[PDB]
Symmetry: C3
Amino acid sequence: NSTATLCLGHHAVPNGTIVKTITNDQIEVTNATELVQSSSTGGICDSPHQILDGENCTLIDALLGDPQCDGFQNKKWDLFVERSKAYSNCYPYDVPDYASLRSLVASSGTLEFNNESFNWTGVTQNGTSSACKRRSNNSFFSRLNWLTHLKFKYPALNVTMPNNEKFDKLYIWGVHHPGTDNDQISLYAQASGRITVSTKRSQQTVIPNIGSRPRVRDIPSRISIYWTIVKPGDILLINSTGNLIAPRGYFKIRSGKSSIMRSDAPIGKCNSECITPNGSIPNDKPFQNVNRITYGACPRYVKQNTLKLATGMRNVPEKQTAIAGFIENGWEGMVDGWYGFRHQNSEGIGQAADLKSTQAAINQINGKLNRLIGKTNEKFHQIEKEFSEVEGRIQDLEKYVEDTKIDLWSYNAELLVALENQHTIDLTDSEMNKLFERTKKQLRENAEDMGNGCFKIYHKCDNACIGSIRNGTYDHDVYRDEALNNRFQIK
Amino acid sequence: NSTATLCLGHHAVPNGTIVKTITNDQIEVTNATELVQSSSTGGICDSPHQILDGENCTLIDALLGDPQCDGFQNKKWDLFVERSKAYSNCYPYDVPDYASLRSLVASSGTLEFNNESFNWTGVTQNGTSSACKRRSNNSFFSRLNWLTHLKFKYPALNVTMPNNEKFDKLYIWGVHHPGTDNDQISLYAQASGRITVSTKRSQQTVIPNIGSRPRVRDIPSRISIYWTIVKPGDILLINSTGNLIAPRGYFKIRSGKSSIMRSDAPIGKCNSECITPNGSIPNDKPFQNVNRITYGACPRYVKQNTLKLATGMRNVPEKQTAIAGFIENGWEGMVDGWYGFRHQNSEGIGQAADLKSTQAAINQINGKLNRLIGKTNEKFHQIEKEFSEVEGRIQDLEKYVEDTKIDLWSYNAELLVALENQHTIDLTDSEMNKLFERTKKQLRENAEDMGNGCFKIYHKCDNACIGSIRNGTYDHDVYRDEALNNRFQIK
Amino acid sequence: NSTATLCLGHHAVPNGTIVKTITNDQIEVTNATELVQSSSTGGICDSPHQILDGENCTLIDALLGDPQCDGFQNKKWDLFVERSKAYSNCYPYDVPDYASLRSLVASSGTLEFNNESFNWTGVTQNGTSSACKRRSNNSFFSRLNWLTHLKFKYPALNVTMPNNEKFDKLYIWGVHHPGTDNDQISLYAQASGRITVSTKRSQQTVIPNIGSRPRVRDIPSRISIYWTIVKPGDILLINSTGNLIAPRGYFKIRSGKSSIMRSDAPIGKCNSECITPNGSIPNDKPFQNVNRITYGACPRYVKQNTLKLATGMRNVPEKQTAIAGFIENGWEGMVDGWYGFRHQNSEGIGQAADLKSTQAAINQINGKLNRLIGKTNEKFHQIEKEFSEVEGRIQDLEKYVEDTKIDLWSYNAELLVALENQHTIDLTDSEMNKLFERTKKQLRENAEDMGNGCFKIYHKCDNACIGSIRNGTYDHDVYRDEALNNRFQIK
Ligand SMILES: *[C@@H]1O[C@H](CO)[C@@H](O[C@@H]2O[C@H](CO)[C@@H](O[C@H]3O[C@H](CO)[C@@H](O)[C@H](O)[C@@H]3O)[C@H](O)[C@H]2NC(C)=O)[C@H](O)[C@H]1NC(C)=O
Ligand SMILES: *[C@@H]1O[C@H](CO)[C@@H](O[C@@H]2O[C@H](CO)[C@@H](O[C@H]3O[C@H](CO)[C@@H](O)[C@H](O)[C@@H]3O)[C@H](O)[C@H]2NC(C)=O)[C@H](O)[C@H]1NC(C)=O
Ligand SMILES: *[C@@H]1O[C@H](CO)[C@@H](O[C@@H]2O[C@H](CO)[C@@H](O[C@H]3O[C@H](CO)[C@@H](O)[C@H](O)[C@@H]3O)[C@H](O)[C@H]2NC(C)=O)[C@H](O)[C@H]1NC(C)=O
Ligand SMILES: *[C@@H]1O[C@H](CO)[C@@H](O[C@@H]2O[C@H](CO)[C@@H](O[C@H]3O[C@H](CO)[C@@H](O)[C@H](O)[C@@H]3O)[C@H](O)[C@H]2NC(C)=O)[C@H](O)[C@H]1NC(C)=O
Ligand SMILES: *[C@@H]1O[C@H](CO)[C@@H](O[C@@H]2O[C@H](CO)[C@@H](O[C@H]3O[C@H](CO)[C@@H](O)[C@H](O)[C@@H]3O)[C@H](O)[C@H]2NC(C)=O)[C@H](O)[C@H]1NC(C)=O
Ligand SMILES: *[C@@H]1O[C@H](CO)[C@@H](O[C@@H]2O[C@H](CO)[C@@H](O[C@H]3O[C@H](CO)[C@@H](O)[C@H](O)[C@@H]3O)[C@H](O)[C@H]2NC(C)=O)[C@H](O)[C@H]1NC(C)=O
Ligand SMILES: *[C@@H]1O[C@H](CO)[C@@H](O[C@@H]2O[C@H](CO)[C@@H](O)[C@H](O)[C@H]2NC(C)=O)[C@H](O)[C@H]1NC(C)=O
Ligand SMILES: *[C@@H]1O[C@H](CO)[C@@H](O[C@@H]2O[C@H](CO)[C@@H](O)[C@H](O)[C@H]2NC(C)=O)[C@H](O)[C@H]1NC(C)=O
Ligand SMILES: *[C@@H]1O[C@H](CO)[C@@H](O[C@@H]2O[C@H](CO)[C@@H](O)[C@H](O)[C@H]2NC(C)=O)[C@H](O)[C@H]1NC(C)=O
Ligand SMILES: *[C@@H]1O[C@H](CO)[C@@H](O)[C@H](O)[C@H]1NC(C)=O
Ligand SMILES: *[C@@H]1O[C@H](CO)[C@@H](O)[C@H](O)[C@H]1NC(C)=O
Ligand SMILES: *[C@@H]1O[C@H](CO)[C@@H](O)[C@H](O)[C@H]1NC(C)=O
Ligand SMILES: *[C@@H]1O[C@H](CO)[C@@H](O)[C@H](O)[C@H]1NC(C)=O
Ligand SMILES: *[C@@H]1O[C@H](CO)[C@@H](O)[C@H](O)[C@H]1NC(C)=O
Ligand SMILES: *[C@@H]1O[C@H](CO)[C@@H](O)[C@H](O)[C@H]1NC(C)=O
Ligand SMILES: *[C@@H]1O[C@H](CO)[C@@H](O)[C@H](O)[C@H]1NC(C)=O
Ligand SMILES: *[C@@H]1O[C@H](CO)[C@@H](O)[C@H](O)[C@H]1NC(C)=O
Ligand SMILES: *[C@@H]1O[C@H](CO)[C@@H](O)[C@H](O)[C@H]1NC(C)=O
Ligand SMILES: *[C@H]1O[C@H](CO)[C@@H](O)[C@H](O)[C@H]1NC(C)=O
Ligand SMILES: *[C@H]1O[C@H](CO)[C@@H](O)[C@H](O)[C@H]1NC(C)=O
Ligand SMILES: *[C@H]1O[C@H](CO)[C@@H](O)[C@H](O)[C@H]1NC(C)=O
C-alpha cells in the first residue's frame, strides 16, 4: 500500500556437506567434491603403458635366462610387474648388489640381447645341470656359458671383445663356487684362482670360494653374478683359469621411462594412466591415499583419506515464518539460480534469479576445479619403498626420504584445501554483498535498508518497476518525489 | 540536548606485542603466543619411553658382551642413549658397516639372546684374553666363542644350525686376525684360510689377514665382526679351518619404534613425550629450534628461534583529549570485553562491552590455538644427523636430505604464521565492522554517521534507549518523527 | 548549477601486464616484476669466491700429482671447476669409491701437502715410468713413491708414522697391479702378497692382482688408489712385501664451505655471488630456472620459466564518452598519483591525485619487494645431480631426493606468487574503497552516491570547497541548509 519490499538472497539446499576452511574446522556448504582418490579397481590396466607380467619370473631370472623365462627373451616394457609367487628354477645364484642390477635393468626397459662369438679355444662350452631343466633335458641359463675343462686341460683364458658400436653394452657374467675340491678338479682340472674382468676404465677381480652351502634344489654350489658396462671405443677383457660362467653376448642398455613394480594385482584389458601395486587408479583427483608406490600420471600420495573442496556457498537454513533476505537466512525455494530477488508489491510476492551473480560464482568455482582436476604429473622409475630384508643405513635413508616427502605433501594438501575453501566462501559471500550494494545504489533515496537483506521501497512499485531494478534500468528520478513524501512524513 | 552520541570501539592494552603478517613485517597486537620451543630442561625424562642409558658402553659393546656391559644382557629399550665417555674394554675389534649393525639393533630395540648348542667337536672352546678381564680373570665377549686348536689339531669345521622357529634369528660372529704367524700356529695349529658363513639365500666369505696393527690396550691383533640373519626354514652353515670367533646363539630381532641417540644429558625421574640430545622438551608448540635430532611426539625442527602467533587484535593507542569510536583509536579503559559501546546522553557518559562480538573473536582465536598447540606427531628411528668421521658420498646425501627438509619446514612455518596472523587481524577487524554495521541498520533514519566510529542520534536517547540499541530491541519507528524533525531542520 | 560532482578514481596504463592470482588465472595489472632468473652471462665470475680452474686436470689428478697438474700444488679453493676436456696423463689408475674421495677433498678445499720421512730402508725409492713424463723425463705422481726391490731383495716393510699434530692427516696411497708375473718379479723380486694399512681405529687390506688389462697409454698394468685419515694421537702402520705405491706425506684436511663443479664456462674477471655450470647468475630474484646445480648465495631452482609478481593494481580501460569514477573504469590521464579526485563545479572540471592513498599502496608493494628481492641464502657443497655412469640404487636415491626437492619448491613458488598477487590486488582495491568511504563520511547529508564512484554534491562547491574535501577540512555544517533544500525539494 504505497510501498513495496525487495529482498536479496541466495539459495540453500536440504543436503549440504561439511568442509574445512581457515576460519572454521567445520562449515556446511551446498556442495563439495573429493580431492583424495581412495579406491582402486584392483586390476592393473594393460593400456596405455606397456606392461610385462613376470608371472613366475623375477626380472633378474628373465635376464639370466632361467628356462621358465624363455618366453621373455628380447621383450621391452614400460612397467615390469614382479609377482610374490615368483621363484628361481635353475642353478642357485646370488647377485652382490642385486638391488642395483635389478634397478638398472628395470630402468633400461629392455631385455634385448645380441650374441657374440667369444674365442673359447681350449675349453668345453655349454655346461649343463640337472638343477636347470629345459624341455626335460639338463640345461643352463640361456645367456650364460658354463665353460669346463677339455681333455683335462683348462688353459688360461685371456679373451677380448671390443665395443665397436655407437651404443653401450651390458655384460652379465658369473663365478662358480663349487661345493667340494672334487667338483673343482672334475670341472676345471686345477685348483681355483681369481677371475679378472676389465676394461680401459674398470676392473673387477673375483675369487671363487670352494665349499658346501646349504643345498638349494639339491645343489650345495653357488654362482655369483657380476656385470660390466662397456662403452663405445672400449674393450672387454676376460682373464680366468677356471670357475668362469661366461657371457654369450651383451644386453642393450637404453635410457627412458621404464620401471618395475611388485604387485599381485591381475592385469586387465582396460586403459588407465596411473598404476599402483593395488591396481590402476583414476587420476582425476590431485591426491590419493591408495599407495605411495606409483607409476605414470598419478595423483600425489598423502596421508589424509579425505579432503573435501567446497564447490558451493555456505548452506544456511531458511528461518521459520513477510519475505526476508540473506541476513542469517538461505532460500531453499530458489532452484534456478544461486542468488536472486524476492519482492512484495501490489501484484503479489515473487522471486527471480540473478544470472550475472550466479554465473560469476559458478565460473570462479569451475576455474579452481580446472586447476585441480585432471592435472596430475607423470613419474616413472623412483626408489623402492617397501623392503623384504633388514639392511640398516641405506634403507633407513630411503625410508626417511619418502616419509619426509609424504609429510610435506600432506601438509601442502591440507593447507591448499583450507585456503581454497576459505576463498570459495569469501567469493560467494562477495557476490551476495555486491548484488545488495548494486541494488542499494540504484534505489538512491527511494528506499531504506530494513537490516534483513531487504529494502523498503517508499513508492508503488509494480511488476515492471521491480523488473527494472533487477534489470538495472530503474530510473530513481521518476519516483523520487513520491518516495520522499512517503519517507519524510510526520505520522 | 535533544540528541545523543553512540560510539563503537574496541579495547587496547598498555603492553602490546609485535607480530608479522602478510600486510606488515611488524604490527602491534594486544597479545601473542610463542610457537617455537627454544629451551630444554637439560635432562632426559625416564618416562613415558623406556630409556636405556649405555653409561660406559656403546650398543655394539653391549651386543658383543664386553664385561663392563654384562648388566645389559637381554634388556629392551625404546631409546638407547649412548654417552660420549663410552669406551671399549675387551679385545680390539672393528665392524665393517658398523653404522648399519648399530642401526638395525637400535631399531629392533632388544638385546634378547638365546643360547644354542653348536657342535664344536675337535676344537677347544672358550678362549680368553688378558685384554678382556671379567671379575679380575682373563675372559672374552660373553656372546662370542673363541675356538682354538685341541692337541695341536684344528679339524675343518662344517657346522649347521637350522632355524625351526617362527621368527628370524640374528647371528653375530667374527674373524680373528692374529698379530703374527707365530700366534696363528699357536692358536689354530695351521696357516690361515677363509671362513664361509652361508644360508640358503646368502653367503659371506672372509679372509683372516695376519699382521701387526698398532697396539690397542696392548693388543696388535684384531677381530672383525660380521652378522647374518637367518629366516624360518633356513639354515646357518659355518665352514672354517681356524680364526673363527663363533656365535653362542642368536639375538631376537624385532620390529617396532625403538631407536638410539647420542647424548650426555642426565636421565631424570620425570615425564616428557619429546626427547632431544639436549634433554626432553615440552611438546605443546608446533615447532622447535632446540635440535634436529628428536625421538617421540616432538615439535618440528625449524631454523627460526621465534615465531609469534597473534592471539588478539591490532593494538591501537587511545587518541588524546567528547567520546570517540574505533576510527584510529582503541579504548584502554575497556577491560571487560574486546568490543563495546560508549554513549553520551542526558544521563551522562557510559561504556558497556558487547559480549557477542567479543566471544566470536575469542572463539576463533581459540580454534586456531587448538589446531596448533599440543598437536605434535611422533617420529622414531630416523637417520643420523651428526657424524664423527669424514665419509664422502653417503654422508653428503644424509646431510643434504636433512638440510632440504629443515629448509622446507622453516618456510612452511614462516608462511603459516604470517597467514594465520593476517587472518587474526582480519577476523578481529571484521567483528568491529559488523558491530558498527548492525548498529547503523537498527538506527535507520534516526542517526547519522559522524565518521569517527560514532553515531549522532537525533532524539533524546536515555539509558534504557541506549540499552535497547545495545540489546538489539530498539524500535526506530517510535523515535522517527522526533529524529526526522531534528535532522532535517533549517537552522 | 547549484550542484557539483566529485568522482573518486585510480590510474590505468596503456601497457599492462598479465599475472596470476588465486581468483584469476589471468588478470591484467599496471606493472609486474619477474621472480625467476632465466639467463646467465655464460661466464663464471672469479670474484668473490676463490675459483680454481682445473683446466686439463681433475681434482683427483691434481691430488695424486700428475705432472701436468704440478702448478696446482698446495692451492686452496672455494670452488674447484672441472672441465669436460680434462684427461689423465700419468700411470693408469682407478679409485674404488672415486666419488667419495673426490667429494671429501672438494669439501676440504685444500691441496696442502706436508712431506714426511718414512723409513724405506731396504728398497729402491722413486720408481718412474715412460707413461708419466715430467719435463721430458720418465717420472711418476708427485705425491706417491713407487718402491721396488734393492739388489733383488724386497724385505717385508713394517713402517710407522705417528700423528703428533693437533689436526687430522689425510694419506693417499696405492697398490700396483702388474701386467705379468715377469713384471712382478722384475719389480718386487717375489710373488705378490697383501698390503695392510692400519691405525688404532681402522684397517684396510688390499690384494695385488697380476694380469693384463686393456692398455691405457700403452700400459696394461694398473694402480688402485686408497686413502686413510689418521687422527691426533693415532699412528699409521704400513705392512707390505711388494706392490706398494707409498705416500710421501699427508694432505691437510680442513672443514669449511668449499665444493667442486663440472662446467665448461669460461672464467671472467667480474663479481657475482651465485655460480652455476652455465655461468654466474644474478641473485636479485628469489627463484631461478638456469640450473639445479648451484654454489653460493643463489636463487632457488624451480621448474617454472617465469613467475610474475604484481607491482601495481588491476589495470582497467577508461570507458568511452560527464566525468565518472572508479566503478568499472580506470583513469589513463592520471599520471601523478595512483588514486585521486575528479570534479565538476562552477569553475570547470579538474583532477588531483591523493598522495596518502597512493603512498600507502606503494609502501606496501615495496615492502613485499623487500622480502623477495636480494634475499637469497647461501649453499655450498651438496650432492651430485648429473651422472656420467649407470650405478643403480645410490644414484636412484640421489636423483629422487633432488626431484622431490625441486617439485616442493616449485609448488611453494607457484603458491607464494598467487597469494602475494591476490594480496596486492586486495590492498590496492582496498585503498580505493577506503578513499571513497572517507569522502562519503565527510559529506554527510550534503551529497548522494551516484553509483559510479561519484558523489552528487547538492550545493555550490567551488575550487576551494572541493580542495577542503580533498584536504579533509570540509565542514559539512556550513553547507547543510543549502544542501538539504536542494536534495529534498518537490520538483
Ligand atoms: C557438486 O559439485 C561437482 C563439481 O562442480 C559437480 O560435479 C560435476 O558435474 C558435471 C555435470 O554432471 C560433470 O561434468 C560432466 O558433464 C558433461 C556434460 O556434457 C559430460 O558430458 C561429461 O562426461 C562431464 O563428466 C563433472 O564431471 C563433475 N565434476 C566433478 C569434479 O565431479 C556436481 O554436479 C555438483 N552436485 C550438485 C548436486 O550440484
Ligand atoms: C657340511 O655340512 C652340510 C650340512 O650337514 C652337509 O650338507 C648335507 O649333505 C648331506 C649329504 O650329502 C645331504 O643329505 C642328502 O643325503 C642323500 C645322499 O644320497 C640325498 O639323497 C638327500 O637328498 C639328502 O638331502 C644334506 O641335504 C646336506 N644338508 C644341507 C643343509 O645342505 C655338507 O655335505 C657338508 N660338507 C662337507 C664337505 O662335508
Ligand atoms: C595471551 O594469549 C595466550 C593464549 O590465548 C593466553 O594463554 C593461555 O591462558 C590460559 C589461561 O591462563 C591457559 O589455560 C589454562 O587455564 C585453565 C583454567 O581452568 C588451567 O586449569 C589449565 O592449566 C590451562 O593451562 C592456556 O594454557 C594459555 N594458552 C597458551 C597457548 O599459552 C594468555 O592468557 C594471554 N595473555 C593475556 C594477558 O591475555
Ligand atoms: C711392526 O711395527 C710396529 C710398530 O713399530 C711394532 O709394534 C710395536 O711393538 C713393540 C715391541 O713389541 C711395542 O713396544 C712394547 O715393548 C715392550 C715389550 O716388552 C712392552 O712391554 C711395551 O708395552 C711396549 O709398548 C710397541 O708398543 C708396538 N708399537 C705399536 C704402534 O703397536 C710391531 O711389533 C712390528 N711388527 C712386527 C711383526 O715386527
Ligand atoms: C614496475 O615495477 C618495478 C618494481 O617496483 C620497478 O622497478 C624498480 O625501479 C626502481 C627505479 O628505477 C629501481 O631502483 C633503482 O633506483 C635507484 C634510484 O636512486 C637507483 O639508484 C638504484 O640503482 C635502483 O636500482 C629498482 O631496482 C626496480 N626494482 C625492481 C625489482 O626491478 C619499475 O620501475 C616499474 N615500472 C614502471 C613502468 O612503473
Ligand atoms: C691378453 O690379451 C690382450 C688383448 O689381446 C693382450 O693385450 C695386447 O697385447 C698386444 C701385444 O703386446 C698389444 O699390441 C701391441 O703390439 C706391439 C708390440 O711391440 C706394440 O708396439 C703396439 O703398441 C701394439 O699395441 C695390444 O695393444 C694389447 N691389447 C690390448 C687391448 O691391451 C695381452 O697382452 C694378453 N695378455 C697376456 C698375458 O698374454
Ligand atoms: C690371464 O691370462 C694369462 C695368459 O694370457 C695367464 O698367464 C699364464 O698363466 C699360466 C697358468 O697359470 C702360466 O703357466 C703362464 O706362464 C702365464 N702366461 C704368461 C704369458 O704370463 C694368467 O694366469 C691369467 N690370469 C688369471 C688371473 O686367470
Ligand atoms: C669346510 O668344511 C669341509 C669339511 O666339511 C672342509 O673340507 C676338508 O678340508 C680338509 C682340510 O683342508 C681337507 O683335508 C679335506 O679333504 C676336506 N674334506 C672334504 C670332504 O672335502 C673345508 O676345508 C672347509 N672349508 C673351509 C673354507 O674352511
Ligand atoms: C708385515 O711385516 C712383517 C715384519 O715386520 C712381516 O713378517 C715377516 O715376513 C717375512 C717375509 O714373508 C717372514 O720371512 C718373516 O718371518 C716375518 N717376520 C715376522 C717377525 O713374523 C709380514 O710379512 C708383513 N706382512 C705383510 C702382509 O706384508
Ligand atoms: C608358475 O608356477 C606354478 C607352480 O609351479 C605353475 O603351476 C604355473 O603353471 C606356472 N605359471 C606359468 C605361467 O608358467
Ligand atoms: C593398497 O595396498 C597397500 C599395501 O599392502 C595397503 O596398505 C592399502 O590398504 C591398499 N589400499 C587400497 C585402497 O586397497
Ligand atoms: C528489463 O528492464 C525493463 C525495464 O526497463 C523491465 O521492465 C523488464 O522486466 C526487464 N527484464 C528482465 C528480464 O528483468
Ligand atoms: C665408567 O668408567 C669410568 C672410568 O673408568 C669409571 O670410573 C666409572 O665408574 C664407570 N661407570 C660405570 C657405571 O661403570
Ligand atoms: C642443543 O645441542 C646442540 C648440539 O650441540 C646445540 O647446537 C644447541 O645450541 C643446543 N640447544 C639448546 C637450547 O641447548
Ligand atoms: C535489553 O533491551 C531492553 C529494551 O528492550 C533494554 O532496556 C535493556 O537495558 C537491555 N539489556 C541489556 C543487558 O542491554
Ligand atoms: C691442455 O691439453 C691440451 C691438449 O693436449 C693442450 O693443447 C693445452 O695446451 C693444455 N692446456 C693447458 C693449460 O695445459
Ligand atoms: C644450463 O645448462 C643446462 C645443463 O646443460 C641446460 O639444460 C640449460 O638449458 C642451461 N640453461 C641456460 C639458461 O643456459
Ligand atoms: C587544504 O584545505 C583547504 C581548506 O581548509 C583547501 O582550500 C586547500 O585547497 C587544501 N589544500 C590542498 C593542497 O588540497
Ligand atoms: C653351445 O655351443 C655349441 C658349441 O660348443 C654350439 O654349437 C651350440 O649351438 C650351443 N648349444 C646350444 C644348446 O645352444
Ligand atoms: C664355555 O664352554 C664350556 C665347554 O667347554 C662350558 O662347560 C662352560 O660353561 C663355558 N664357560 C663359561 C666360563 O661360561
Ligand atoms: C726421491 O727420493 C730420493 C731418495 O732416494 C731423494 O734423494 C730425491 O730427492 C727424490 N727424487 C726426486 C726426483 O724428487
